[PDB]
Structures are given as C-alpha cells and as structure tokens.
Amino acid sequence: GTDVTSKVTVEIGSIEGHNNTNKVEPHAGQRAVLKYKLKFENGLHQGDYFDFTLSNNVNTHGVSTARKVPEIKNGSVVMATGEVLEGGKIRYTFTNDIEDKVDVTAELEINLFIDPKTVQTNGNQTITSTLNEEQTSKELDVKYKDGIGNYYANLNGSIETFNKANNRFSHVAFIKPNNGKTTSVTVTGTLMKGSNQNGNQPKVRIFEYLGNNEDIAKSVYANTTDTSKFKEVTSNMSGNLNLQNNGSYSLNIENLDKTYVVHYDGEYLNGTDEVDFRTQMVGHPEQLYKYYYDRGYTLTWDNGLVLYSN
C-alpha cells in the first residue's frame, strides 16, 4: 500500500520525563514517554503506512534487541502495527480494520529510552518526535550514576543488550585507578539472579582504554571497535581469566594502573523473574601485614533487569 503520512494529524502531542518532571535518570531505569492523539483522513486501506521520526538521543527499545512498538488500537481492534525501520524511524502500517472507517482517531503511548551512545554526558537534551511536519518537543535533564569508588579505584557498569529470544545479555564494566595509585585486583562477574547452573561459559573480553579519563562516557558506553580508544587485551590476560558454566568469571590484574573495560556476553536461565549481574572488584593496597591483616577493599556494582512481576 502507500505512504499516507500526509493524512495523519497530531491533535495532541507531548513528551514527558520521569513522573512528569523535566528530568530523567536512565541508570535508575527511568525513561521519557511520548503521547500522541492522532486524527486520520478517511479512505485508508490495509498496508497503507505512516512514519514519524524521533531525535537520535532516544529510542524505543533501551537494552532490548527487539524492535517492536505498541499497536495502535481502536479499543480492541488493531488498526496499525509498528516497527522500527532505522534512524530513528517508526512506521505504522494499517490493518484491514481501517477499511471504510470514518473520523478515525487514536491514542499512542511510547516509552523513549535515553540512548547511551548518543547521550554520553549529563545535561539537557531536547527530545523530539516529528510526524507529518508537526514537531513535538521536550527538554529533559539527563543524569547518570558515577559508579562506586574509593581512594584507590572506581567501578561502574551497565547492561548493554538484552536478548529474550536467545536468553542472552551483554554488559559493560569500567574499572580504573584513582589518585595515581596502583593496586593489584581481582574482578568478578556473578549472576546473583538468573544463573543457569548448567549453561555455557560466558564470553568475556577486556580492553585497555587509550583516551583521557575525562572523556569516558558518563552514560557507560564503550565503542570497542574504535581502535584509537580501545585496545583489546583479552589474549594477553587469558591466563588470568577463569570462566564458569554458571555464568561467573574471575579476572586477576596485577597492576591496576590503567582504565579497563570488561565486556561480558552471557546467558541467563529461561524463566527467571529477574537477571541480576554483579561486578565486584577486590583490591589489595598493601601486603606487608605488619601489625595487622585485612582483605583490602571491595567495590560492588549490580545491574539488573525485571523480566516478570508478579
């Protein structure tokens, strides 16, 4: 069928931030929300379609690999289905149920997640959706978390991708020294929820960051295929890496004197209510043990998804 974008009118359009404030915290699992009330011209047919375009600071998926959006209904009847085509382009295609309908209107609510690749820093973003030349627009202040640190090191992470069809997810962790200090460390990954005790061993890849620390994305984002920014050292570190069938890994680094990224791709147990992935770093700043012993510091950062509640 044909492009009937010019036949769709936005009657009411708005974009809102978390709880209808002007702020969004993506690392607390918050998001923006686009709401539309659309009027349609008469005489549309099945297979006819309309497109709108989102600013590339947001998308409709967050960590999900899936690319569906909500259906446009008239009560119970599916009027249109929607798909993400590309940048960042949402197309709704009309069903058979638009045929011979008159004065059709419809509401549409779509969650809009802040993209960590295009929104790398804290601060205001202007979020827009454009439908048939009508621009709907909202400024939101995006605020990210800084990980967890001490005088010696910082640990931060985020789930990168989530793939329901394969029971897989990927995760990015950044580990760095602070204050010019070098400590010897053990870094672990553990599925605190959602471990498949009898699964495959995870793929874990480690990269040396080559840039200035000031340019590390606040969003927690590593484009590890930029070879001026990242150097893969997985080979070099392979004798210090252990992988387990319950999804855990462990990694020893004798001198933490550089910023590293650890990329994890693993599976989770089918049916789990939740997936909760812990990255933990244990450091030993001193090993003289004169007058005292203790085990050093521990930094712990968890990233979790809810798959069922409840």
UniProtKB/Swiss-Prot annotation:
Residue span of region Fibrinogen/elastin/tropoelastin-binding: 1-310
Organism encoding this protein: Staphylococcus aureus (strain NCTC 8325 / PS 47)
Effect of A222G: Significant reduction in fibrinogen and elastin binding
Superkingdom of the source species: Bacteria
Name used for this protein in its record: Fibronectin-binding protein A
The protein's role, per its UniProt record: Possesses multiple, substituting fibronectin (Fn) binding regions, each capable of conferring adherence to both soluble and immobilized forms of Fn. This confers to S.aureus the ability to invade endothelial cells both in vivo and in vitro, without requiring additional factors, although in a slow and inefficient way through actin rearrangements in host cells. This invasion process is mediated by integrin alpha-5/beta-1.
Span within the parent record: 194 to 503 of 1018
Signals that turn on the gene: Expressed predominantly on cells from early exponential phase of growth. Up-regulated by sigma-B factor during early growth stages but not in later stages, although this positive effect on transcription is most probably indirect. Up-regulated by SarA. Down-regulated by Agr.
Region entry Ligand-binding A region, spans: 1-310
Gene that this sequence comes from: fnbA
Known outcome of mutating T161A: Small reduction in fibrinogen binding and greater reduction in elastin binding
Extra information: Fg-binding activity is not regulated by the divalent cations Ca(2+), Mn(2+) or Mg(2+). Deletion of the Fg-binding domain of FnbA abrogates the ability to promote cardiac valve infection and persistence in vivo.
Subcellular location: Secreted, Cell wall
